[PDB]
Design an enzyme around this catalytic site. Structure first.
Site, PDB file in Angstrom:
ATOM      1  N   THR A   1     -24.660  -3.283  16.564  1.00 18.63           N
ATOM      2  CA  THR A   1     -25.363  -2.942  15.562  1.00 18.63           C
ATOM      3  C   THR A   1     -23.893  -2.192  14.838  1.00 18.63           C
ATOM      4  O   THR A   1     -22.501  -1.989  15.016  1.00 18.63           O
ATOM      5  CB  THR A   1     -26.180  -0.919  15.456  1.00 18.63           C
ATOM      6  N   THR A   2     -23.982  -1.617  13.165  1.00 17.46           N
ATOM      7  CA  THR A   2     -22.548  -1.381  12.884  1.00 17.46           C
ATOM      8  C   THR A   2     -22.042  -0.068  13.285  1.00 17.46           C
ATOM      9  O   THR A   2     -22.903   0.739  12.635  1.00 17.46           O
ATOM     10  CB  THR A   2     -22.798  -1.153  11.034  1.00 17.46           C
TER      11      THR A   2
END
Ligand SMILES: [Cl-]
Ligand SMILES: [Mg+2]
Ligand SMILES: [Mg+2]
Ligand SMILES: [Mg+2]
Lengths: 250, 229, 241, 196, 204, 226, 243, 195, 244
Positions: free
Chosen positions: G30-31
């Site tokens: 995920t970012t």
């Protein structure tokens, strides 16, 4: 982490060959020629200072090394392997001999200790053999002058004269024709310089040749006076000027 | 095995209706030499606990660092570090008590007598003692060193048993503590006039008082005393 | 063909992992240069900050190993910092044990010996870096000693490292062929830095701003790196003649 | 031994006598008890000479390695390293150490580390066998933010009295001044300080 | 209690003209009790002689140790160890037990086979070498031996004169020591002949 | 034992007596107390004689290896640092008290070191049971900017004070002079003021004085051929 | 070939393929981002809501080291936790010996050397995380990003994970439009926006925003999580910008 | 334990060892055999600290029996005594030394000679015509010094041994409850059941 | 991890053979031939140096025959460096025994010890075996003159006459043909040299290509003497036996 290579990296092949030792010897073959000649009153060891760059100061790279005051060593093959072997050889001369007997080891026994270290790199776990052949010249009271070759396998042989590395086959033939049991040290140096010229392509002078002798005791190199029994080191590295002087009488 | 070098004297404490009070002077003695005059021997942990330490000061500073580290560690991966999962007085004591007993069991003690004073999550008063031997006990009043011999008798006249605690206000308790500190100053040759006092109350929280002094001292009667017989 | 994966000999007597570690050395695409003055040793290195999100003050391949020794690295930064930390530890320990500052050449030899071990012991990989150590040694004077993944090391009058090392090397070779001395005959280190930058410009055929370079200077009893404004002053002097 | 460190307006000054005794014999009458662990972090040593030298050398090593990695250490950091060695090895050490240093941010700071290995930050500190005789004098005469000249006089007069009464103290009075201007060594001979 | 004087005994060594002599008493005891009159304290490894006084178990142990080491020395060096070298080996070996030492007073005697030079040396129980030109003494009557040797000794004595000097030094020293005596042996050592003589002495 | 070290113009000189004792008994009358750590770094030892010899040789050995490793001539501060750290580790159980002196590329140096590992710097030092006698002479005659000849004179006079006045010291004076840019000159038995007078009587016995029980040839030769 | 089967093996290129494969795990994550502001740093991360059964605000991703450093990472979460545990040991030993809390550059190297150590041997696997971390020390604010290779640098803004390209472009705009700098409160708002914008690469599932910050003025140089009203204000600001 | 005597005569070795075992106040046993057979022609008697004596003796016995099986060969008395000495010499510098004194009586079948070795707990070995440990020698050696001959028969050795025991029984304060006597010769080891 | 590169030196083949042992034996078959012959009055050791040079210093050279103690010697076939490791260990074992029992080590006990060390490398440790075969020539007062051989497997056997190294099949047949039990040392010397002369791969057998030793009770009276022959002495015995 932990060294998990606890198994031999050198093993016997079906034909009975120890591959890694053979390949180490191949690396020695590619190495720059070095030689040794034994005279009646001394030993000479010599090699070419193959400078990797002209900007490099080749004096800071010592191919010929003092092991004890009366023992010197030169090599052919991988320089870095040689350097560490010199460090280990110098130490073992103290730890396994001088700190016990209060004197420096005889040539043959120091050679034996170096040979043992190289043998162990051929059998111990997670290591390759040393990629060098050594020529060790020395003197001691009871054995006199001697010259030894030590190979990657740990095998060592005494020589009257020999050569290792690049042009060893031709050099050894050259030495066979010239060597006799009546050579004086200066004659051996002369033959060494002649032999070494054949394997050298470019410049041939005191700055491109490294040469040392095991000869007379040098009280001028002892650093102190007052003890009659201490007469100085028999190992002496020839200067650039001293080599060039003998190249005029060549 | 060692010997204490720089030392702190009595720590005294008692329970009252809404919390606990603890006090200790600001002296670091070097034998009979009153060497260091600005030593804080009450160390707060969060807003609900005060740890009072007597004995060896170097060990006190080590314990001080353990407690500081305990707060840091508790906050790790703990979204409720300032709420439900904050350090309780009981957690802090049990940890210290474990360390003290472990250290004496290795024949290398932290040369201290410690009183952990605080108020629990449910509002309960916490007051418990631990020393270099790992010995622990609780009582409505607790004191270390000389305080055990001189402060406790005075403090026990206020809270003699458990049922006296709800009848004891913070004013009466603080008054008793302050008087005890004066008595210790009269009679303990390793005490100082300057002290710190901490109140941990379930309503008003932690009140930390620094730079307090022993006052209202009686010395005038000394002028009439002459000779030794 | 596992003789190519670990540091054992190939049938030709070669160590391929060592050879490939030399190739990793040029992964940063940075060139460095070192030269000696009368009283100093100067090392310059290209500085490339390709990302605007980077803090340019933290992008460096020059290290202050000890008070006297500086080190520039050619190779990836993780291996560079690995070598840097070790060199610092070795230099500090040396001083503690033997009561005097570790010489530049001795440190180079020590780091070279460590590198040699990685070429002989299978469990340890070589570091993909070339280490150029600089100082003004109290016995030897201005010193440049360079170590590589093979465990080889040697002193230099001057040296260059990187993808375009050959161009810089030949440029330096030609200058010393003219002057016939082993150093830059200059009093101030400022002018030795100017010489170093000028000859890198000539060799590479590129111009430099103050942020395109990184400079380290060794003098007696201290090694230090120049700020961007110190380098700017250097670049102005070069342009004004 | 008589040693002290005193903070003042421009930084801090360390002071010491130069007498080292083996019983009643003065083994060294020109000892240097002011030791450098970093450029502007010095210490005064008392107790076992072997112990304090060993400790100081280790600290110097630690601060050198610290400097190579993290830049100039604070005086507090130096005191912490001293303390760590003294506290953890308290059973096998007899060392009383005063640490004094100059930062630009913190200016002059003094930390005393007595036998137990505790740390105490003070405006000034006195230690060694001779210090006992000058607790009264130093307490009465010390002021904060003195000038360099006043602090030199304060240390000179103090150590003069310590030397006068303590047989274990004597010789010359050495001093090291730590300020932004740099590091200055001072020495005062018996003929000077005995007539004070 | 004192380990160096439980068993008793003495060794003395002297130099002469192109010769060395080493001698010892034959007593082994358990304090006051005489136990053996055949406990020789001189041993040899090739042409190098080693006398050892002190605690008898250590005397035996060190003899076995130095036999061990000089045998390996010979196999590797391809020559017999010399007195000067052996002296260093004794010193090294003793000092390696610095904090748990052999309670002994060793004495080396011999002639260097190459130089022909007479050599003697003494050691304390941890390896400090005493390389005297004249004489070395050791054991429970070392004081008495020092007194005898200091007056009786003169340099450059011929082998058969040296025999009389060292014999009289031992005998009269031993007779003033309760824990020494019960027989004596004297070795006269020349470059390529060694003579061993047992002396007649009082048996109390 | 009396041992001194004296700094001078262009170097340092060290001196010692030659008596080694076992309690009140003189074991060796011509003991060598001046030890070589390296060609131009010498030291003299008091205390446990074998601790002084052993610690010298060990550091001397390691100094030699260090010199070879670094391609540099050994420094006195290196010998000092290695000695003190070794001695400190053994907490005084190695009873070596040394005066260490020498010349190196940095200059000339003089140090003392005691069994527990503490070291000291000085222009003149003395050690051993005759140190107080020696130091009395040094404190009476030492001055700054001594010449080589003056320093040798002062050093040997200080040893003589020990020889005559200290019962632990005696016999001869050994000296070693270490000058900058020169070979260190070891002067064994520099002074010999204690030669024994001729005895009143010769104690050479008539041959056949000693009673003999048995004679035999000792086989020192190896097992023979044929 | 076979150079990519073992860690610490140099390929003929001079590459460590196992480290490059670890980067793939990071890129799959995920970012997460970091923004360096005027007197501190802000960290933010995208938390994918795999299911409704996930308890909101409970599965906290950002981790504190000591009391002044924040750490966030993308990739294999357990690897990131292992790295932070080491970081906490490193910070504790530093403070134990030197008293002062570990400086951020000092801390950065401690992580860097540890990660780099896991590229030296075939008996260990490289870290499957890129870690964005930082805080405030005596020399001010610092933001770092550390890769599987052990490589790290200081940053003005940093981003990693699946939506890193989008995030980086947004960060680059902020750097250009604010040479004078960004305030801590502004950085929190901007961090919320950037995560929301970077969520286009993970648009299938909805997500939960998590922000933290260390600021000299706003948090006294201590690491704190953005909670309650300040978090909702940042979410509103972010939602307004995407519409 | 207390009295252990040994005498080497012409063709045999005789070991005499007391039978008493005293634990402080009481004599717990009066028939204790303070000996172990190490090999068919080698016997070892022992005395010293309680527990250590038997532990050491059995340990030695096991080792010699192991050697005998491995090599199918009986070690000479000299070889056995040297092994035993080393064990004790090793033991004396141990954490807790064996406080055990031994006599080793063996008949060497190669040399056709009896051999008696005396070894104390320090590892002090001596070969003797007759020996003892503790105070036993103080009472008996003057009699052995007088009467002993190297060409004595086994019967004469036993008679001289009786005189020694009688002197011990007269002048020793402790009651050692007589002795068990064993003879070691070319035919092996046997016990004299009436003494 | 590391398993990938492990050759596994201590495993059985499907036929129940130890790969490395078998391959080490193959290596030894290319080493210079060594021969031992036991007679009633002594033992002979004869061995061929491998293709030498004229510049080799023969009188200080030792590659085949080694002294273990005064009573026991060995002839080596295989890797010389490997042999020296084992030889030093054997020398130490002999001295350990002498210190413990105050008697010289019996020949078989020394042989068993070395053979056990070789065995260990075939069963555990994961290391390559020693590429060495020994012929042990020794004397003790139990069995008298003895000949043994050991190989990389750690198996050892006793012999009246035996060869190791190159051309052992041809050598053993020749020894089996001419050996008799009542043979004497001087006869055994001749047999050994004749056998080498026929089996050698060289054109002719000369002194510079040989190492020679005898263990004789030809030591004055009741003792044993080891004789490592000098180059000139090997030259003389070659002329005496009529080979040159
Ligand atoms: Cl190294
Ligand atoms: Mg490798
Ligand atoms: Mg005074
Ligand atoms: Mg007597």
């Amino acid at each position: 982490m932990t060294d998990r290579y606890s198994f031999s990296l050198t093993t016997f092949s079906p034909s009975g060959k120890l591959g890694q030792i053979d390949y180490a010897l191949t690396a020695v073959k590619q190495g720059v020629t070095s030689l040794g000649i034994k005279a009646t009153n001394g030993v000479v060891i010599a090699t070419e200072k193959k400078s990797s760059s002209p900007l490099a100061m080749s004096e800071t790279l010592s191919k010929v090394s003092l092991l004890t005051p009366d023992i010197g060593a030169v090599y052919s093959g991988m320089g870095p392997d040689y350097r560490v072997l010199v460090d280990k050889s110098r130490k073992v001369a103290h730890t396994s001999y001088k700190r016990i007997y209060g004197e420096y080891p005889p040539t043959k026994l120091l050679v034996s200790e170096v040979a043992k270290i190289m043998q162990e790199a051929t059998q111990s776990g997670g290591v390759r053999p040393f990629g060098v052949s050594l020529l060790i010249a020395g003197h001691d009271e009871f054995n006199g002058f001697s010259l030894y070759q030590v190979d990657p396998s740990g095998s060592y042989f005494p020589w009257k004269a020999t050569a290792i590395g690049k042009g060893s086959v031709a050099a050894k033939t050259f030495l066979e024709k010239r060597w006799n049991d009546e050579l004086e040290l200066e004659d051996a140096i002369h033959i060494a310089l002649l032999t070494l010229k054949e394997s050298v392509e470019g410049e041939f002078n005191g700055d491109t040749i490294e040469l040392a002798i095991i000869g007379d005791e040098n009280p001028d190199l002892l650093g102190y006076t007052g003890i009659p029994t201490d007469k100085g080191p028999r190992f002496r590295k020839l200067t650039s000027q001293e080599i060039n002087d003998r190249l005029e009488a060549l | 095995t060692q010997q204490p070098i720089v030392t702190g004297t009595s720590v005294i404490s008692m329970k009252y209706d809404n919390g606990v009070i603890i006090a200790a002077d600001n002296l670091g003695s070097y034998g009979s030499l009153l060497r260091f005059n600005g030593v804080e021997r009450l160390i707060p942990v969060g807003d609900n606990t005060v740890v009072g330490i007597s004995g060896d000061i170097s060990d006190m500073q080590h314990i001080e660092r353990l407690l500081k580290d305990l707060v840091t560690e508790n906050a790790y991966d703990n979204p409720l570090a300032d709420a439900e999962e904050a350090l309780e007085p009981s957690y802090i004591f049990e940890y210290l008590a474990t360390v003290m007993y472990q250290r004496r069991s290795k024949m290398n003690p932290l040369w201290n007598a410690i009183i952990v004073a605080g108020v629990q999550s449910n509002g309960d008063q916490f007051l418990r003692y631990v020393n270099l031997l790992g010995v622990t006990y609780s009582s409505p009043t607790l004191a270390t060193g000389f305080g055990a011999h001189m402060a406790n008798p005075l403090l026990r006249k206020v809270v003699d048993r458990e049922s006296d605690i709800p009848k004891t206000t913070v004013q009466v308790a603080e008054e008793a503590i302050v008087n005890a500190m004066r008595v210790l100053y009269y009679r303990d040759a390793r005490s100082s006039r300057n002290f710190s006092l901490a109140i941990i109350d379930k309503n008003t929280g932690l009140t930390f008082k620094k730079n307090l002094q022993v006052e209202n001292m009686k010395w005038d009667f000394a002028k009439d005393i002459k000779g030794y017989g | 063909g596992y003789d190519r994966h670990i540091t054992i000999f190939s049938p030709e007597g070669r160590l391929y992992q060592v050879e490939y570690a030399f190739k990793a050395t040029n992964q940063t695409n940075i060139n460095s240069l070192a030269v000696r003055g009368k009283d100093c040793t100067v090392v310059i290195s290209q500085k490339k900050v390709p990302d605007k999100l980077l803090d340019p003050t933290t992008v460096s391949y020059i290290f202050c190993i000890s008070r006297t020794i500086g080190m520039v690295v050619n190779g990836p930064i993780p291996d560079a910092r690995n070598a840097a930390l070790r060199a610092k530890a070795e230099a500090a320990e040396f001083r503690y044990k033997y009561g005097y500052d570790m010489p530049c050449d001795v440190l180079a030899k020590r780091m070279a010996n460590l590198s040699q071990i990685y070429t002989q012991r299978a469990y340890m990989r070589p570091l993909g870096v070339i280490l150029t150590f600089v100082s003004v040694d109290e016995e030897l004077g201005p010193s440049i000693y360079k170590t590589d993944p093979a465990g080889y090391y040697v002193g230099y009058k001057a040296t260059a490292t990187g993808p375009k090392q050959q161009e810089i090397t030949t440029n330096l070779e030609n200058h010393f062929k003219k002057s016939k001395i082993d150093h830059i005959n200059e009093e101030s280190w400022e002018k030795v830095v100017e010489f170093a930058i000028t000859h890198m410009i000539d060799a590479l055929g590129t111009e430099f701003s103050k942020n395109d370079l990184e400079v380290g200077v060794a003098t007696k009893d201290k090694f230090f790196t120049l700020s961007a404004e110190n380098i700017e002053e250097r670049l102005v002097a070069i342009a004004e003649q | 031994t008589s040693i002290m460190a005193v903070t003042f307006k421009d930084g801090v000054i360390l002071g010491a006598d130069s007498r080292t005794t083996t019983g009643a014999y003065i083994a060294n009458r020109v000892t240097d008890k002011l030791t450098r662990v970093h450029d502007k972090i010095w210490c005064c040593r008392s107790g076992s000479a072997a112990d304090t030298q060993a400790i100081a050398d280790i600290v110097q090593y630690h601060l050198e390695l610290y400097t190579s990695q993290y830049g100039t250490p604070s005086t507090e950091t130096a005191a912490s390293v001293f303390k760590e060695l003294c506290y953890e090895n308290k059973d096998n050490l007899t060392a009383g150490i005063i640490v004094a240093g100059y930062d630009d941010k913190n200016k002059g700071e003094v930390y005393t580390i007595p036998l137990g290995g505790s740390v105490h930050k003070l405006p000034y500190a006195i230690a060694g066998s001779g210090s006992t005789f000058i607790y009264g004098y130093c307490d009465k005469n010390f002021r904060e933010n003195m000038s360099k000249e006043e602090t030199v006089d304060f240390i000179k007069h103090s150590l003069s009295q310590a030397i006068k009464w303590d047989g274990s103290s004597g010789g010359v009075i050495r001093m090291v001044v730590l300020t932004a201007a740099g590091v200055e060594r001072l020495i005062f001979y018996p003929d000077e300080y005995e007539q004070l | 209690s004192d380990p160096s004087s439980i068993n008793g005994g003495i060794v003395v060594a002297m130099t002469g003209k192109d010769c060395v002599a080493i001698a010892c008493d034959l007593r082994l005891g358990s304090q006051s009790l005489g136990v053996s009159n055949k406990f020789e304290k001189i041993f040899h490894y090739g042409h190098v002689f080693l006398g050892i006084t002190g605690l008898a178990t250590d005397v035996t142990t060190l003899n076995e140790m130095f036999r061990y080491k000089t045998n390996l020395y010979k196999l590797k060096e391809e020559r017999a160890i010399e007195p000067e070298t052996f002296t260093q080996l004794v010193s090294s070996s003793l000092y390696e037990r610095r904090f748990g030492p052999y309670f002994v007073g060793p004495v080396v005697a011999g002639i260097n086979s190459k130089s022909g030079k007479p050599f003697i040396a003494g050691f304390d129980l941890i390896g400090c070498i005493d390389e005297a030109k004249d004489f070395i003494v050791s054991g429970t009557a070392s004081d008495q031996l020092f007194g005898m040797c200091e007056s009786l000794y003169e340099p450059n004595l011929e082998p058969e004169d040296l025999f009389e000097t060292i014999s009289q030094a031992l005998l009269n020293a031993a007779d003033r020591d309760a824990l020494s005596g019960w027989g004596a042996v004297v070795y006269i050592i020349k470059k390529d002949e060694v003579v061993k003589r047992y002396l007649k002495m009082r048996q109390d | 034992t009396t041992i001194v070290g004296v700094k001078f113009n262009n170097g340092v000189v060290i001196a010692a007596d030659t008596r080694s004792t076992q309690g009140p008994i003189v074991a060796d009358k011509n003991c060598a107390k001046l030890h070589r750590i390296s060609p131009k770094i010498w030291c003299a030892g008091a205390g446990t004689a074998a601790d002084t010899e052993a610690v010298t040789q060990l550091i001397g050995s390691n100094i030699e290896l260090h010199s070879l490793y670094t391609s540099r001539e050994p420094r006195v501060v290196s010998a000092l640092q290695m000695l003190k750290q070794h001695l400190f580790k053994y907490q005084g159980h190695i009873g070596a008290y040394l005066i260490v002196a020498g010349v190196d590329p940095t200059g000339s140096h003089l140090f003392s070191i005691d069994a527990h590992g503490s070291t000291d710097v000085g222009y003149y030092l003395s050690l051993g049971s005759g140190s107080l006698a020696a130091m009395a002479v040094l404190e009476s005659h030492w001055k700054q900017d001594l010449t080589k000849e003056e320093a040798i004179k002062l050093a040997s006079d200080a040893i003589q004070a020990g020889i005559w006045n200290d019962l632990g010291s005696g016999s001869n004076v050994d000296v070693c002079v270490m000058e900058i840019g020169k070979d260190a000159e070891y002067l064994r038995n520099y002074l010999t003021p204690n030669v024994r007078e001729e005895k009143q009587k010769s104690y050479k016995f008539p041959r056949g004085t000693t009673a003999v029980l048995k004679e035999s040839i000792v086989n020192i030769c190896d097992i023979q051929e044929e | 070939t076979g150079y990519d089967l073992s860690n610490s093996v140099f390929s003929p290129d001079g590459r460590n393929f196992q480290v490059e494969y670890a980067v793939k795990a990071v890129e799959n994550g995920t970012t997460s981002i970091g923004i360096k502001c005027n007197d501190g740093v802000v960290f933010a991360v995208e938390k994918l809501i795999t299911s409704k059964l996930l308890v909101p605000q409970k599965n906290v991703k950002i981790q504190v080291v000591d009391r002044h450093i924040g750490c966030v990472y993308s990739g294999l979460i357990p690897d990131g936790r292992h790295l932070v545990n080491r970081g906490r040991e490193e910070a504790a030993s530093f403070k134990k010996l030197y008293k002062t809390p570990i400086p951020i550059p000092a801390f950065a190297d401690r992580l860097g050397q540890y990660v780099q150590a896991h590229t030296l041997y075939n008996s260990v696997r490289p870290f499957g995380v890129s870690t964005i971390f930082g805080g405030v020390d005596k020399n001010g604010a610092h933001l770092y990003m550390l890769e599987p290779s052990g490589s790290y640098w200081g940053y003005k803004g940093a981003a990693t994970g699946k939506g890193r390209q989008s995030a980086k472009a947004e960060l680059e705009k902020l750097v250009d439009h604010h040479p004078e700098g960004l305030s801590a409160r502004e950085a929190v708002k901007q961090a919320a926006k950037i995560i929301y914008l970077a969520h286009e690469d993970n648009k299938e599932k909805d997500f939960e925003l998590e922000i933290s910050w260390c600021s000299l003025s706003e948090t006294n140089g201590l690491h704190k999580f953005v909670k309650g009203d300040l978090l909702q204000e940042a979410i509103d600001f972010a939602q307004k910008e995407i519409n | 334990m207390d009295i252990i005597l040994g005498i080497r005569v012409q063709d045999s070795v005789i070991l005499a060892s007391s039978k008493a075992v005293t634990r402080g106040i009481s004599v717990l046993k009066d028939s204790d055999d303070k000996t172990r057979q190490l090999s068919p022609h080698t016997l070892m008697s022992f005395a010293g600290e309680a527990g250590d004596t038997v532990q050491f003796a059995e340990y030695i016995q096991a080792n010699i029996q192991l050697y005998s099986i491995r090599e199918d060969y009986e070690l000479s008395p000299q070889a056995v005594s040297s092994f035993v000495r080393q064990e004790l010499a090793k033991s004396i510098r141990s954490r807790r030394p064996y406080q055990v004194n031994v006599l080793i009586g063996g008949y060497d079948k190669k040399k056709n000679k009896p051999e008696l070795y005396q070894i104390d707990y320090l590892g002090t070995k001596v070969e003797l015509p007759y020996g003892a440990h503790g105070y036993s020698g103080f009472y008996t050696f003057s009699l052995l010094d007088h009467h002993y001959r190297p060409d004595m028969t086994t019967e004469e050795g036993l008679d001289l041994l009786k005189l020694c025991v009688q002197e011990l029984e007269k002048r020793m304060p402790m009651d050692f409850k007589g002795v068990i006597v064993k003879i070691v010769d070319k035919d092996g080891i046997r016990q004299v059941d009436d003494f | 991890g590391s398993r990938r590169y492990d050759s596994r030196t201590t495993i059985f083949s499907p036929e129940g053979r130890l790969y490395q042992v078998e391959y080490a034996l193959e290596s030894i078959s290319h080493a210079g031939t060594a021969i031992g012959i036991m007679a009633s009055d002594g033992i002979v050791l004869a061995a061929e140096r491998k293709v030498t040079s004229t510049l080799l210093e023969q009188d200080t050279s030792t590659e085949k025959l080694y002294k273990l103690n005064d009573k026991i010697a060995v002839a080596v076939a295989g890797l010389t460096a490997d042999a020296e490791i084992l030889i030093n260990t054997a020398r130490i074992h002999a001295q350990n025994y002498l210190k413990t029992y105050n008697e010289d080590i019996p020949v078989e006990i020394l042989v068993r010890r070395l053979s056990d060390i070789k065995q260990g490398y075939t069963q555990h440790g994961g290391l390559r075996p020693f590429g060495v075969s020994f012929i042990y020539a020794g004397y003790d007062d139990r069995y008298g003159y003895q000949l043994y051989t050991s190989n990389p497997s750690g198996n050892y056997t006793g012999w009246k006459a035996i060869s190791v190294g190159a051309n052992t099949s041809a050598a053993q047949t020749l020894l089996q043909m001419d050996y008799k039990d009542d043979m004497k040392v001087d006869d055994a010397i001749e047999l050994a040299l004749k056998t080498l002369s026929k089996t050698t791969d060289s054109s002719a057998l000369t002194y510079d290509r040989l190492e020679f030793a005898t263990i004789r009770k030809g030591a004055n009276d009741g003792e044993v003497y080891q004789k490592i022959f000098k180059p000139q002495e090997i030259k003389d015995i070659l002329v005496k036996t009529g080979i040159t």
